[PDB]
Write a protein that binds this ligand. Structure first.
Ligand code: ZN
Ligand code: ZN
Ligand code: ZN
Ligand code: ZN
Lengths: 144, 152
């Protein structure tokens, strides 16, 4: 029923969505552009509107992230609020996906590794990194 | 046999999570508050006094409208909280139990002195409800009611 979603204000969500699709393996990408009619209403050209995003979404590791363009109204993305992806180390399907995702992302030039993804002394796995847009991601594997 | 599904949680870096947790308990009606303080033994390891460690938080959680928020102290390492990443609470307008809780929560929070209303919580032309506000810590919350009845 009730669910929480981060809602990110990107400078350009069109670019950011292509980045997550390529670097993070993001799936189910949906993007609502500023319509040709809406261009005049917002105060932009036909081309500027085609590049702009009203509302968007993408799934990373089966979790949904919502986003929209800043339109010069939002603050720059920082690490004050990080996105933690929690998974059960005893759920093979998810555990393998997290493994594959990290394997594919760990060496990427856009990714800044804060804590390499690894098994922690008291249990589970924990990894921390920041992407080129400044989003801080934390991968948290727990034993339930 | 029993497994949990993958879930996303915001992880907030507060200057003081102890204070912030009391604020959410009081102003937001936050429930299931759990706080792990810096232990007396850990104080020396962290480079702080016994008192400073009792006030400090290593890990914490709280529920608002049945959704979980994680947090920890900044310890001067994290950036100041802004609206680059907002927290959207999504619910069904046609689920009376949840709809009433969202209504009651908003009614209780709208007039508070800590709360800055960006968009009053209201029905939207194309369907559902939407409301937007920022708290004293700079967290931007969005309330979003969805109608799953087709337009046609
Ligand atoms: Zn959509
Ligand atoms: Zn852990
Ligand atoms: Zn806990
Ligand atoms: Zn809506």
């Amino acid at each position: 029923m009730t669910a929480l979603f981060p809602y990110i204000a990107f400078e350009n969500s069109k670019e950011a969505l292509a980045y997550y699709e390529e670097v993070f393996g993001a799936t189910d990408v949906k993007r609502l552009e500023v319509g040709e009619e809406q261009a005049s209403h917002f105060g932009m050209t036909k081309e500027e509107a085609q590049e702009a995003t009203m509302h968007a979404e993408f799934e990373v590791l089966g979790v949904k992230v919502l986003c929209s363009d800043s339109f010069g109204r939002a603050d720059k993305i920082n690490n004050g609020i990080s996105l933690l992806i929690d998974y059960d180390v005893n759920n093979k399907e998810d555990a393998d996906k997290v493994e594959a995702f990290y394997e594919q992302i760990k060496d990427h030039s856009s990714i800044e590794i804060e804590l390499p993804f690894a098994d922690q002394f008291w249990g589970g796995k924990m990894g921390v990194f920041t992407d080129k847009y400044g989003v801080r991601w934390m991968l948290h594997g727990q034993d339930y």
